[PDB]
């Protein structure tokens, strides 16, 4: 009767929030049972509900993040959390375009005097 | 002998890898030979020990031809528990005696889809080796 991540992804925001609410009221009831003695079966269910709550929340967060990435795809300016986080040093270096572009003087030399493949006899 | 310069022959390192091994490779460490009939039926020699396969102890106090079903694979202690491999303690109850899986032979395999996949996996590699060294 447990909840999985795969079957949660087809659901829409309304019932995912509904699913999360039902787990929260159940966890609070389990926490009440823990204080008033309860039973070992109810104590062991505390972890199960807690991971179920984490399971629902991560699907909501992943679905939201995926939609936001789709919404901002192709736009010039993106939120910082949607931009790549390689490394502070790596985000400051020249991109591929300005790393390989050359001056007209440089490409004239390469066109006129390209490196030749050659061999020498003994 | 060992020629690969990236695998160590250091005794302290090998012992450290063995006693601190994660459970998913402790399973591979806790492998057992198959019986002659099983080694002939499947083209495989050894097999990681499984929960519900039945073995006979071949070394120790509990040696014999009696076939006992494995009841626990307790990887933290590198031992398995078998049905009738047990002893009495002081207060009269029985406790299973853990023995190393390398000291049993598997007479019968608990067969599911995953074991059969591994069984033909091992046999196919052995057959390739046989036809490579033919």
């Amino acid at each position: 009767a447990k909840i999985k991540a795969r079957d949660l992804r087809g659901k829409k925001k309304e019932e995912l929030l509904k699913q999360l609410d039902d787990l929260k009221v159940e966890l609070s009831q389990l926490r009440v049972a823990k204080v008033t003695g309860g039973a070992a079966s109810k104590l062991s269910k505390i972890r199960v509900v807690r991971k179920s709550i984490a399971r629902v929340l991560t699907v909501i967060n992943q679905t939201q993040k995926e939609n936001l990435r789709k919404f901002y795809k192709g736009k010039k300016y993106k939120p910082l959390d949607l931009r790549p986080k390689k490394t502070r040093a790596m985000r400051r270096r020249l991109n591929k375009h300005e790393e390989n572009l050359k001056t007209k003087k440089q490409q004239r030399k390469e066109r006129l005097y390209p490196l030749r493949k050659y061999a020498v006899k003994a | 002998m060992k020629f690969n310069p990236f695998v160590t022959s250091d005794r302290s390192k090998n012992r450290k890898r063995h006693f601190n091994a994660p459970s998913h490779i402790r399973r591979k460490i806790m492998s057992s030979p198959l019986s002659k009939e099983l080694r002939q039926k499947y083209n495989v020699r050894s097999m990681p020990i499984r929960k519900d396969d039945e073995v006979q102890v071949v070394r120790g106090h509990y040696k014999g031809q009696q076939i006992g079903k494995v009841v626990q694979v307790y990887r933290k202690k590198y031992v398995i528990y078998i049905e009738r491999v047990q002893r009495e303690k002081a207060n009269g109850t029985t406790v299973h005696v853990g023995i190393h899986p390398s000291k049993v032979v598997i007479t019968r395999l608990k067969l599911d889809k995953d074991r059969k996949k591994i069984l033909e996996r091992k046999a196919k590699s052995r057959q390739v080796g046989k036809e490579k060294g033919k």
């Binding site: 400051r92 270096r93 300005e98 001056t103 | -």
Partner: protein, 135 residues
């Protein structure tokens, strides 16, 4: 010059080190001007500097800075070198023209102190005992 910053001119030690006045800083005032411009503008890169006038108590210099992250600099070759991380704070490592003059670099018999790239490099090489495997 550079007054030694000791309380009451007391340099506790041998008489050869008693000097407090008539002492001189190793780097020029132009290097100090580049250092102060670079430190305040930490996001820029010091290129060079020149002299624009002096008073009896002040020398005035103008320092050329480059914004390494501007597209006009970033998209132009022959100015892309200043954008590399190895070229940050040149004036604080003596890599500008003014800062280089104090390092004693050069070619020939007048500059034997800096063979290897610096005084340290020459000193370390000349004061390291090479203990070969076979001696």
């Amino acid at each position: 010059g550079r007054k030694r910053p000791v309380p009451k001119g007391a340099t506790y030690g041998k008489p050869v080190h008693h000097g407090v006045n008539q002492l001189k800083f190793a780097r020029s005032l132009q290097s100090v001007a580049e250092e102060r411009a670079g430190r305040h503008c930490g996001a820029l890169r010091v290129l060079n500097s020149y002299w624009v006038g002096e008073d009896s108590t002040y020398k005035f210099f103008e320092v050329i800075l480059i914004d390494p992250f501007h597209k006009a600099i970033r998209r132009n070759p022959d100015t892309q070198w200043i954008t590399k991380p190895v070229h940050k704070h040149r004036e604080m490592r003596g890599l500008t023209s003014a800062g280089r003059k104090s390092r004693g670099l050069g070619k020939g018999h007048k500059f034997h102190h800096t063979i290897g790239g610096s005084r340290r490099a020459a000193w370390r090489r000349r004061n390291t005992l090479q203990l070969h495997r076979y001696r």
